[PDB]
Design a protein around this ligand. Structure first.
Ligand code: 7OU
Ligand code: CA
Lengths: 703, 706
């Protein structure tokens, strides 16, 4: 049942370290590789920067003719001699704080205007930022591929070489995220128009969905500025769909070109989204790759985990991210393409004793492999660094291969992992709770994000009150998922799109965090789930609209629900818990015919009910709670206990986190202390131990 | 010349703990007070909530007639019996996670729409957010003061009662700030128009400053919407000046009212600004009090410190904030009206081991008194909790008066303070560095802040490139102040407004973080400073405009500087440090006339120079750096060393922070480890070496008898 990497026909925990040959004294390349191998790592990972090797137009140095650190061939030879497998990342974009994000200076200098990403007035957004589908950009990308891909093809694992995986480009769409700006290049806007025509077929069909009054597709303009009308929301929704298709077209073009060289190894891509040590935005970035993950089951996405510290402030971020990637990519191991080792930023400290705890927590939270980023510090060669001379700090090795404090922490965790990987990789948690991932609530990188300065989405202007980013960040990510983890209840996440009914029926509860809109397909799925015997928990809204904010009340009518939306005090009572703080004045007040009232406003109006529908059970709460009080944990606990779900252990200290992982034969109990307190506690199944601050203990049980 | 509190003509460390009588079983009041007293605390602090005591309109209970916990009189009497002095805070706002932020439900239901803070469209910003100078709001506030102020007056120290201090309202402007919108109530609009007419006298004079073409004052309205023209910036600048007069008017009205009851005790106010465990916007909020602090020498402002954790991530916020309070309030002790104890929110943990280090760090960083907030947990009665039933967590005492882990940390810190206060309160750090606090860079709460919904200020639209909020957050607060503290260089902060030349001349260096604009008075002061023998470090810009973005080239002309603004790579070299990352493409390029060039762009153009001018020294850097790379610390270290400024100690681990405080008798060495690493290091005075082991997120204090 578990997905994991394999080596010598056994489960293999992928332990990779990032070592940028182009940023390291070549005399010390062998020393870095030997010190990496000596931690128990099996793989090394690096960019092959286009700028670094195509030194002028059609002048390629991969052999150190012009600088010894351009000798990629020798670095590959060294990986073979030191028995490390190799992950290569030739771009064209590599980011990695490399000048021009890895694109050559000579290329950016001579590309025409129409090869760049353009704002809505036709201005170049950034002198570094090309349009992914520019004919000029792809012509030169292909000329770089023509030189680097034969080297990669020769050394690929399919030819018994060291190269086991290759990453295509780097964090596709990351520049649209960080800026909030879409590419309005006329070639992108022409592709958008093809996508719309393809989708709706006739202007009359589009007009009926958008409530527009176009006489033809020729009157359709790309959306821009703030959303004022429901028709602007609709246009922006399809603009988000279009960019997911667009990224799939871009990665497909790169993939087909790579395959043309007989490169048959595993291809990868990498998911950004951590900011200031939390990852509540990362599911939005995952959502931008929905079409890639649909269309390319041979491309493994990995996570970019950047926790910065390890505490209760961010304990829930890595688990939520791991569970969501598993939802969206169930057929591949969950792995970290970039797994924090040291720090990108000198002033943002990464302590060995914090990261060691993060690495063990990552095992507890289901990670199957990772690439320490950065294992080795780098020195930017002559003016190639976008920032200072130094690339990363507090790594395992400095740029001169001096061992730093993190080295011994990585050796200790790698030793544990190698000892256990055969059993540990084959263990799972027993989840009786399933949490729905409704991808359309996440499709907002152009209109509403933590990085977007000025919000283009203001739902009040559309006659709505539940903002999908507030819901997915505060009610879902920082609320339910944080609460379940804190309470030590296992959950799984499931992608609701084209979702198997049979795959929901394993779980004793399905939790849906719902806004006022939800497509017919998901409303029908949830209707069938309950009617066939499923237990659904749904809040803060029974949806009444589809993704285009057109009437859709399938779930409401199937469940015999009637409500009025009414203003009350933020505080409600729910299952006899008084003073539950809720996010909104506006609540759904339910007709209680054939229902049990279980929640009440300050004026005693019914804002939550339970009822039987066919063979199943429904719990609807017409109010939004996250986790910002002890009453919120008490409510999540009451709701889980409605279907008699139990924790795997009794632990005497409720602030100790545990994860029980098992298979037929083996059990691992991971105890995690996310607090600045020495804790002493005991445990028993549904026995006394001391854990230092910000630390861990792993217990093995034979079954 | 330290500022500290005095009791019986002796130095006295103010130690208060916050104990909310209205959230504690009255049968347990005495036990809370005794346990606070047993920590060596001398004072207890509480709100008196309007909503709690005016139970219906004109129905008052301070005696526990309708609920035992309304017996304010008994609580006051117990404070006296248990030998604690008492800070009272009767509002009208208390915030304090109390329903409607302390305002009665019956009041907010009764008030007409014009009692409320209104947005640009005339809509109510929040149903518990009043407009401060609303006629209706102040009428009911006065009727609340009519009943609570005679009790406070009767129980003052001078009448042998326990009351020594009273807070006026609570964090003026904090609710407006968190709302993300400013108040456009018609009272604000009308008071603004009067302010503009008083300021400019004629529409011609206003048109000449703004470059507008108004026919009369009747054509001008309070500015709304984004700044697109320099005239819109001018309008908003006067709107910011107006709001400082407005907050002074509010607190003057409360103060004059309080004084009419024969209340002669010390009045206080409390400074907000911490959010998510840093305080980079606190200087903006304290800036909104500029007119209060000039007009009321008898109101002492204290800080509300909420660090939430204690690490290098937020190490610099408390020192910066303490230094900025001292700059604005130089004649009163630096103290914390609210000093974090436990956590206001269950999901944001407050660890005893963190807060104990915060308490010692605060002493290192010159705090002279504090009120542990919250010393005692509360339970909200009768649904009064804004966010839940429980008020605070991981406090010194739970609501029942059981000791929690933090109790022992507070007893340890208090014991050290009581043993040492007579010397400690009289100690100084030796600061050879002065950093200028230019208040108008902070006057952006209407147009640019971390909390404001709308970005109204885009300097590029104005032909500018140095955003004042970017400068003051990243180049000053998180940049220079963070770097000096990390490098263990003592600094003082000095308010440049009406600044005495003589108060700047004691320092070896004066550091000015400058935008492209600065008023004539400040340009002149910095000119005179250097000409008379001061050493000035100025970056990232020689200013050329005044506060209204009109021509002012006084400092440029007085220092004999010629420059062109030119685009280049973000990276410069400075004093032989290569690949120093700077915030802007645009840099000031200086010619080398009568100067030593000491920084260069990627094209080897001069973007930094040093020169002698009259008796003084000038170092200008035409580029912006904060602290986002090792090169920045190297650069700050080099600039400090230009005047042979030395650290107090040689310490073997550069990541150990230290503060040496001394007087004639006594030296205290504070070591602070803001890192998750057990550190073993040696040290020595810059005039054999001592070895120290320090736990993660921990401290040592050495005392020496001189
Ligand atoms: O609707 C409201 C009104 C007031 C209000 C005050 C609150 O507290 C303030 O929070 C600031 C930010 O962290 C601090 O700078 C300040 O010192 C605190 O007094 C709060 O948490 C929530 C609130 O919600
Ligand atoms: Ca019904």
């Amino acid at each position: 049942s578990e997905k994991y990497f394999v080596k010598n026909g056994q489960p293999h925990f992928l332990i990779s370290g990032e070592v940028h040959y182009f940023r390291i004294n070549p005399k010390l390349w062998r020393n870095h590789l030997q010190l990496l191998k000596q931690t128990g790592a099996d793989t090394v990972s690096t960019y092959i920067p286009w700028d670094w090797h195509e030194i002028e137009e059609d002048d390629f140095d991969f052999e150190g003719k012009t600088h010894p650190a351009r000798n990629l061939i020798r670095f590959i030879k060294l990986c073979k001699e030191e028995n490390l497998d190799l992950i290569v990342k030739p771009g064209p974009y590599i980011l990695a704080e490399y000048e021009n994000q890895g694109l050559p200076s000579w290329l950016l200098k001579k590309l025409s205007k129409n090869a760049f990403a353009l704002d809505e007035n036709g201005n170049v957004i950034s002198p570094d930022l090309v349009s992914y589908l520019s004919d000029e950009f792809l012509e030169y990308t292909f000329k770089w591929y023509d030189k680097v891909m034969p080297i990669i093809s020769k050394h690929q694992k399919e030819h018994y070489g060291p190269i086991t995986m290759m990453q295509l480009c780097n964090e596709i769409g990351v520049f649209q995220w960080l800026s909030g700006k879409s590419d309005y290049n006329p070639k992108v806007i022409n592709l958008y128009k093809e996508f719309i025509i393809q989708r709706y077929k006739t202007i009359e069909k589009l007009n009926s969905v958008y409530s527009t009054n176009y006489n033809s597709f020729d009157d359709l303009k790309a959306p821009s500025g703030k959303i004022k009308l429901r028709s602007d929301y609709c246009a922006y929704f399809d603009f988000h769909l279009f960019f997911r298709e667009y990224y799939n077209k871009y990665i497909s073009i790169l993939k087909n070109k790579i395959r043309s060289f007989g490169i048959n190894i595993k291809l990868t891509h990498n998911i950004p989204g951590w900011i200031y040590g939390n990852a509540s935005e990362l599911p939005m970035l995952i959502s931008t790759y929905s079409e890639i993950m649909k269309n390319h089951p041979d491309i493994i996405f990995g996570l970019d985990h950047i926790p910065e510290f390890v505490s209760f402030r961010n304990a829930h971020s890595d688990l939520a991210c791991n569970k969501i990637l598993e939802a969206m990519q169930p057929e591949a191991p969950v792995w970290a393409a970039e797994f924090q080792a040291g720090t990108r930023e000198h002033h943002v400290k990464a302590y060995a004793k914090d990261l060691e705890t993060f690495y063990i927590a990552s095992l507890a939270h289901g990670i199957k492999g990772f690439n320490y980023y950065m294992f080795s510090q780098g020195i930017n060669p002559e003016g190639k660094g976008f920032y200072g001379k130094t690339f990363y700090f507090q790594t395992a090795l400095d740029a001169a291969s001096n061992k730093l404090a993190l080295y011994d922490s990585i050796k200790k965790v790698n030793r544990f992992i190698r000892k256990e990987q055969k059993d540990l990789l084959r263990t799972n948690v027993n989840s009786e709770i399933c949490v729905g991932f409704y991808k359309p609530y996440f499709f907002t990188e152009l209109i509403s994000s933590q990085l977007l300065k000025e919000k283009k989405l203001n739902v009040e202007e559309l006659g709505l009150y539940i903002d999908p980013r507030f819901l997915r960040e505060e009610i879902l990510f920082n609320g339910l998922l944080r609460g379940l983890q804190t309470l030590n209840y296992n959950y799984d996440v499931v992608d609701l799109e084209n979702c198997d009914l049979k795959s929901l029926t394993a779980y004793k509860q399905l939790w849906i965090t719902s806004a006022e809109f939800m497509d017919a397909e998901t409303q029908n799925l949830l209707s069938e789930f309950v009617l066939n015997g499923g237990n659904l928990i749904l809040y803060p809204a029974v949806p009444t609209l589809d993704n285009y904010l057109n009437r859709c009340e399938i779930l409401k009518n199937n469940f015999g629900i009637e409500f009025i939306t009414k203003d009350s005090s933020h505080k409600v009572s729910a299952f006899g818990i008084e003073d539950v703080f809720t996010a909104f004045s506006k609540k759904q007040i339910y007709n209680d015919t054939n229902s049990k009232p279980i929640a009440f406003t300050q004026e005693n109006e019914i804002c939550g009910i339970r009822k039987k529908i066919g063979k199943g059970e429904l719990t609807i709460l017409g109010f939004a709670f996250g986790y910002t009080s002890d009453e919120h944990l008490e409510l999540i606990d009451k709701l889980v206990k409605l279907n008699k779900i139990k924790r795997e252990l009794f632990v005497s200290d409720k602030d100790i986190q545990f994860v029980v992982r098992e298979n037929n034969k083996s059990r691992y109990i991971f105890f995690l202390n996310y607090h600045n307190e020495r804790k002493t506690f005991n445990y028993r199944k549904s026995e006394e131990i001391s854990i230092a601050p910000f630390s861990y203990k792993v217990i093995k049980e034979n079954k």
